């Protein structure tokens, strides 16, 4: 099995001109500087770029790349894309589920992992948790081994690796490469790229390629690179690293002069007489994606439990501040105070939903181009795994605690209307948080955006300005605010049977107005309906704002530039 | 001029045993792994650690280190401690001001820079801005040159460098080291430490030292390290880097075996017969520190102007939402709504004052141990440079815009009471932000803490809960809240002459209470004084909370573990 390619022009700006060569079944290496194309050619051969940006061909065993090529090959991203919150046995049963056939047995899913984890030397760390900052786990040298086993499930013949040495120590990385050297002879074509290599790494290759500022300088087997650059005019001095002496040529102990040597290279001319011979299921896809982030959710107390501890404590403090809300003249200020405080929590804690996708963005990109899932199966699964339980709970933790301490309206249904309303505004402000943050790798931008947006929703929620007393070319903005509809519903839920002028039965007559002596007089003066549609109008507003903002999140995850 | 040392035990945990050697006037190099003591010994000889943690001696030319040793020597931190927002001519006039004598002429301050910037090759980039992420400037290879010139002002004979190669490219770092090689012969003793060195770097030294896991393995000149480790049992193979072959010994192609070779090293025995021969003004300090951060403040529109654009726009939006606050039944909700919104801005924008010290923490540590300032001179200067102008302005931008659009109380003094009150709560919430964040290098912790603290101040400010209706074992917490005192003052400033029941003169009698038909009835019911002390009580509360929280910030910057 061989790779091959010819006349590749890649632009957005051509940081390449054309690259020519073939890659044998063996150990294919790309070296050079970071500004060079050493990271861009590898995304070309692994089809990780825009095909309209691509110009030339990729021909494999006399066949072009099909749609089946990504589904039988493996590229490994430079950072740890593994689930360090899970273990190796758990994570390799994930990648067995979405890559092996549905017809294949769970026994076969038990065995084919064990043909691989036994090969990687990871039999010690099978059920050992891989490792987080906050949970001690396996050393990072086998986190690199963990991701390679994630890309060896269906036995891909063609292996790709983004920077197998960077991120690891010196003898740490050698145990990776000898494992890859064991893979170098079992019929597995490893094609990778190393910044700042070493002669201990250099002594074990099979083929080699140098790129510098988008220009090609070497092709062929790896031994003869030292043999060729002697004829270029240099000499490798006594006791120098050869892989570092290969970069001694580059930056002036000019680029146009060295490439003209390569056009007249006999290593090119054999390749010139070689390339022109050549150029001449969904329920299962939701069964295991929901489980994987679920064990991410259990395997992080500092993000799951630590947001319950904030919820329980602030559940109890608000239980102590308010405590039996009186039906006196101060009663309106307290009841409208806590319900404005709950809804804004619900909203200002939904900024933590941006922690979900932005951290999982780079894992989303690699896993879909690999083809582990349809995008909706990611999207009907992770919302089942993280959007559902982490927002059902604080909408019950707030609801069970602060209801009977404060003495909010002592009926059965209104306990559950408040339970459901905080549940929706938790979802709805999370959905907007997903809608903005979908397809953004930056945190500090989108976190600032919702912080702007929620504040411009806080004003129109009804407490900080009376919504009927806004100029009528702004009173259309009161519809675009999630803290309005929840806080409208909670004010609708609670202020119905209440009274606030003790001694003054107001429901028959209110003598001496400007008084606000019943709950309806507060509720109408805020511009809120009294018919029972006016409660659930808010929910179907919020239900539509969930579906719209998830769809904008679904389209941004669909129309994303994955390449 | 030589350094020397003997029998150094350093604990908190002894990650050392004892290190012996001298350092000639030349080029002194420390190599090894990151877990080794190669970064810890350099802080020992430059006195950057706890002297109680130190055991042995540091003897210089037959004299111990005085208090004058830090005032005539230079250590350069690994990251860019330069002011990339300023230029080289501006930044080297800073380090000329705080290091040269007060008797020395400004002409001499013009000349001695020009003896150095001419030496560094930085004459092209003299007035060129050095560089930010958001302002294009000089390349990072001369940012490293910029910091060395900051530590060559009073001509220190003894130079120290934290990691002179890390952070720069290959040929980028050589132009640094050849400059240091030019310094290696002008009578300047450079003592540094390099992770992952190279033979182009290795071929120019004068003395050499290896550390590994707190153990010493070499001392002497740099040529003979390749000569010595042959006798240890190895041989440097054909075409290998010698400085990388010196780490080939370390991690098993054990630590106790290789150190016993060094006890029986003849390079140690000459040193054993060499060490035992040896062992046998404030206004000026505020004149220029205030200027330097001032030009940091001008040289960052994305942090200075971008917090005015937010202030002007939200100045205008609040001008449009409210716009001529009516004296009707909704008038209480609007006026108490905006004043609660202004004070919480003032407070929740003071979270951006944590951006000040936490970023400038590592520059504060290096510059005080160098001795550029007394700590109060840093502290009376930077508050003059950043705390003063960036909080005088939005307390005028809010004040000029939203006063006459909204029609807040049309008197002359109340315009300036509101101007001054927003100025204090800007300072006071910034002072707490300085008091918490002083001595913390983490951002995400302290930003979370004030976000917790301001929310537990937002409740007690008086809008979300009526303060008189709290249980009396919590009504002492209403004093520990900055958004109370400002919002108390703004409610005191504005609700005096107002009326809110139109048609109903309330100041003679209020028939039919529960009404809130004048501004005092709202103001008393919140539990706020009506005497004119009750206004300025809030200010002297806030003035004391500035001085206390700055003192806690002054003590945390004083009692900090600088080492």
């Amino acid at each position, epitope marked *: 099995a061989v790779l091959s390619f010819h006349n590749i022009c890649y632009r957005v700006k051509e940081i390449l001109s054309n690259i020519n060569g073939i890659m044998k079944p063996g150990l294919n290496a790309i070296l050079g500087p970071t500004g060079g194309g050493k990271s861009s050619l590898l995304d070309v051969l692994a089809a990780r770029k825009d095909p309209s940006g691509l110009s030339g061909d990729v021909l494999i065993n006399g066949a072009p790349r099909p749609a089946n090529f990504k589904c039988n090959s493996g590229y490994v991203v430079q950072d740890d894309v593994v689930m360090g919150t899970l273990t190796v046995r758990e994570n390799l049963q994930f990648s067995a589920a979405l890559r092996l056939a549905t017809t294949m047995t769970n026994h076969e899913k038990n065995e084919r992992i064990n043909r691989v984890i036994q090969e990687l030397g990871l039999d010690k760390v099978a059920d050992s948790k891989v490792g987080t900052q906050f949970i001690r786990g396996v050393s990072g040298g086998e986190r690199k081994r963990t991701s390679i086993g994630m890309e060896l499930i269906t036995d891909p013949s063609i292996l790709f690796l983004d920077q197998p040495t960077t991120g690891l120590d010196s003898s740490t990385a050698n145990a990776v490469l000898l494992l890859l050297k064991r893979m170098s002879k079992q019929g597995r074509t490893i094609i990778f790229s190393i910044h700042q290599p070493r002669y201990s790494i250099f002594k074990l290759f099979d083929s080699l390629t140098l790129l510098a500022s988008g220009r090609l300088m070497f092709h062929g087997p790896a031994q003869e690179a030292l043999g060729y650059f002697e004829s270029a005019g240099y000499h490798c001095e006594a006791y120098n690293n050869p892989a570092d002496f290969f970069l001694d040529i580059i930056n002036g102990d000019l680029i146009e002069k060295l490439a003209e040597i390569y056009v007249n290279s006999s290593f090119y001319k054999e390749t010139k007489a070689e390339l022109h011979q050549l150029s001449g299921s969904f329920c299962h896809q939701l069964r295991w994606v929901s489980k994987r982030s679920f064990k991410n959710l259990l395997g992080n107390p500092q993000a799951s439990i630590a947001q319950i501890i904030v919820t329980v404590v602030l559940g109890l403090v608000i239980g102590a501040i308010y405590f039996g809300l009186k039906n006196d003249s101060t009663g309106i200020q307290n009841r409208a105070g806590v319900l404005f405080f709950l809804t804004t929590n619900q909203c200002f804690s939904s900024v933590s939903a941006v922690e979900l996708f932005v951290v999982e963005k780079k894992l989303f990109i690699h896993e879909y181009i690999s083809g582990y899932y349809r995008v909706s199966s990611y999207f009907l699964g992770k919302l089942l795994s993280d959007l559902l339980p982490m927002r059902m709970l604080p909408s019950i933790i707030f609801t069970c605690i602060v209801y009977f301490m404060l003495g909010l309206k002592p009926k059965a249904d209104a306990f559950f209307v408040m339970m459901f309303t905080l549940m929706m505004v938790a979802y709805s402000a999370s959905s907007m948080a997903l809608a903005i943050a979908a397809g953004q790798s930056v945190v500090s931008v989108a976190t600032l955006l919702m912080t702007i947006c929620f504040v411009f929703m806080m004003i129109f929620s009804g407490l900080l300005v009376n919504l009927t007393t806004i100029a009528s070319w702004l009173s259309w903005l009161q519809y675009f605010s999630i803290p309005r509809y929840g806080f409208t519903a909670l004010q609708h839920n609670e202020f119905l049977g209440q009274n606030f002028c003790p001694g003054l039965n107001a429901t028959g*007559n209110n*003598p001496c*107005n*400007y008084a606000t002596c019943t709950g309806e*007089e507060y509720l*109408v003066k805020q511009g809120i309906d009294l018919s029972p549609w006016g409660l659930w109008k808010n929910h179907v507003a919020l239900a539509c704002m969930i579906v719209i903002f998830l769809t904008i999140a679904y389209l941004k995850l669909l129309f994303l530039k994955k390449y | 001029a030589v350094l020397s040392f003997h029998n150094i035990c350093y604990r908190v945990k002894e990650i050392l045993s004892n290190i012996n050697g001298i350092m000639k006037p030349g080029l002194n190099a420390i190599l090894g792994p990151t877990g080794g003591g190669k970064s810890s010994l350099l802080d020992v000889l430059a006195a950057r650690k706890d002297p109680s943690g130190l055991s042995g001696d540091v003897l210089i030319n037959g004299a111990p280190r005085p208090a004058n040793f830090k005032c005539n020597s230079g250590y350069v931190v690994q990251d860019d401690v330069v002011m990339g927002t300023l230029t080289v001519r501006e930044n080297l006039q800073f380090s000329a001001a705080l290091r040269l004598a007060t008797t020395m002429t400004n002409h001499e301050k013009n000349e001695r820079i020009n003896r150095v910037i001419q030496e560094l090759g930085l004459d092209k980039v003299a007035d060129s801005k050095v560089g930010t992420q958001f302002i294009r400037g000089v390349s990072g290879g001369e940012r490293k040159r910029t910091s060395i010139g900051m530590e060559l002002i009073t001509d220190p004979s003894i130079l120290f460098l934290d990691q002179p190669t890390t952070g720069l490219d290959s040929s980028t770092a050589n132009a640094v080291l050849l400059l240091l090689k030019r310094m290696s012969k002008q009578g300047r003793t450079i003592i540094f430490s390099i992770h992952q060195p190279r033979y182009s770097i290795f071929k120019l030294f004068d003395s050499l030292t290896l550390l590994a896991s707190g153990r010493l393995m070499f001392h002497g000149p740099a040529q003979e390290a390749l000569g010595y480790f042959e006798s240890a049992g190895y041989h440097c193979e054909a075409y290998n880097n010698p400085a990388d072959f010196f780490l080939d010994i370390i991690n098993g192609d054990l630590i106790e075996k290789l150190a016993e070779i060094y006890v029986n090293s003849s390079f140690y025995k000459e040193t054993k017969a060499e060490l035992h021969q040896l062992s046998g003004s404030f206004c000026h300090q505020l004149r220029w520190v205030s200027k330097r951060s001032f030009k940091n403040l001008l040289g960052n529109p994305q942090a200075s102007i971008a917090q005015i654009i937010v202030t002007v726009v939200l100045g205008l939006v609040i001008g449009a939402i409210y716009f001529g606050l009516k004296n009707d039944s909704t008038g209480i909700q609007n006026r108490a709504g905006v004043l609660f919104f202004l004070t919480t801005n003032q407070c929740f924008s003071s979270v951006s004052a944590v951006e000040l010290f936490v970023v400038e923490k590592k520059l504060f540590i290096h510059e005080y141990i160098s001795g550029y300032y007394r700590v109060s001179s840093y502290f009376l200067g930077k508050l003059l440079s950043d705390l003063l102008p960036m909080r005088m302005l939005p307390s005028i931008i809010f004040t000029c815009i939203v006063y006459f659009m909204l029609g807040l109380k049309p008197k002359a003094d109340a315009f300036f009471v509101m101007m001054f009150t927003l100025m204090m709560v800007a300072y006071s919430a910034s002072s707490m932000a300085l008091a918490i964040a002083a001595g913390q290098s983490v951002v995400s912790v302290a930003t979370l803490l004030m976000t917790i603290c301001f929310v537990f101040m937002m409740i007690f400010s008086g809008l979300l809960v009526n303060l008189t209706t709290i249980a009396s074992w919590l009504s002492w917490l209403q004093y520990f809240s900055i958004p109370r005192y400002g919002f108390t003052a703004l409610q005191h400033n504005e609700f005096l002459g107002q009326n809110f*029941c139109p*048609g109903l*003169n309330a100041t003679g009698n209020n028939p*039919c209470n529960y009404a809130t038909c004048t501004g005092e009835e709202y103001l008393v019911k919140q539990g706020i004084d009506l005497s004119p002390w009750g206004l300025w009580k809030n200010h002297v509360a806030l003035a004391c909370m500035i001085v206390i929280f700055l003192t806690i910030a002054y003590l945390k910057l004083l009692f900090l573990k600088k080492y």
Partner: antibody
Amino acid sequence: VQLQESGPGLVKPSQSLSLTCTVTGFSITSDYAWNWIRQFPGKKLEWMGYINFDGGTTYNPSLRGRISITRDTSKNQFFLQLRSVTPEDTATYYCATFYGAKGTLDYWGQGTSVTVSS
Amino acid sequence: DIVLTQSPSSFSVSLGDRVTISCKASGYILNRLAWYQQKPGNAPRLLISGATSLETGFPSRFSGTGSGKDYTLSISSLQTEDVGTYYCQQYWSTPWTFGGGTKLEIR
């Protein structure tokens, strides 16, 4: 308690209008808010805007920039200055009296008619 | 704003009849619903404040029974002196719109 208008019962179009409501039995600086009412032929009432007891005022937002109410406190008067008068608003005008706490138009004027023709 | 549709713009009743004048609101008024009575050539005399109260200077026949939006006036066994033009007013908001004003007749 006792209100009365006195003004021109005619005007040229598109210039101005002046009415004056002199209040006896009570002082307009004491308690209430003081508002004007017009009633069209083809009778539909249309409240116009109140001046408060302390000179503040709020006008009916259909009549923006056209109505203004001033007051001369030293003899208990408050003035109707209605500018750029179209011939369509040839209504019967009134001055009236608002309690604030009772909430209703408790006392009214006598009734002045304005005909806007030429 | 709040418009006050007196949907029965007129009537045709006889003496001693219980007539019921509706006043449909375009929003919740919460008993802030006045009633006036303009005899021809006069200013509107106030009849009922609060939508349930009454004003001194009338028999106990005029009686408002309103709730929510559907406010109405009940005139049990009207007299000769009670034909007029009954205007309902909201005094909830600031643009105090009145009703269209029904007008009683005699068959």
